[PDB]
Design a protein around this ligand. Structure first.
Ligand code: 2SJ
Ligand code: NA
Ligand code: NA
Length: 124
């Protein structure tokens, strides 16, 4: 059975809009979302559908771009690093569950390279 998705909105948290947070939604997330290899990462891993009965035994901090999109939208992150950490968690989850050179891993690696290039261009 799948777990509920990660939390995406917390109204009790203070909210701010920042250059970097806008860039993360409007440029970084938008570009990754449209990538050839985006689709596996656009929603939580559905371990039941994908037939990975052990997935949530091994991955205890699931993350995905749908979740990240929501978090940005709901001003869930105070600091840009929180967002960057979520992307890093998503890529690493893939590397952790799978094995070096797996097709899915290569796809994640490609997405990550684009992500890193975009991060290098994050505004001050
Ligand atoms: C976002 O993470 C994952 C997303 C997916 C898969 C997966 O496990 C290999 C993941 O975890 C690393 C996946 C799973 C099971 C399959 O049977 C399959 O054919 C295919 C896949 C994936 N496609 C591949 C491996 O080529 C697509 C969905
Ligand atoms: Na398969
Ligand atoms: Na590519």
């Amino acid at each position: 059975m799948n777990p509920p998705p990660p939390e995406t909105s917390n109204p009790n948290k203070p909210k701010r809009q920042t250059n970097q947070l806008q860039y993360l939604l409007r440029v970084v997330l938008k570009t990754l979302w449209k990538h050839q290899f985006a689709w596996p990462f656009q929603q939580p891993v559905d371990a039941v559908k994908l037939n990975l009965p052990d997935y949530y035994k091994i991955i205890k901090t699931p993350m995905d771009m749908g979740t990240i999109k929501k978090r940005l939208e709901n001003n869930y992150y105070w600091n840009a690093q929180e967002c960057i950490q979520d992307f890093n968690t998503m890529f690493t989850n893939c590397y952790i569950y799978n094995k070096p050179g797996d097709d899915i891993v290569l796809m994640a690696e490609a997405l990550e390279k684009l992500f890193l290039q975009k991060i290098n261009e994050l505004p001050t």
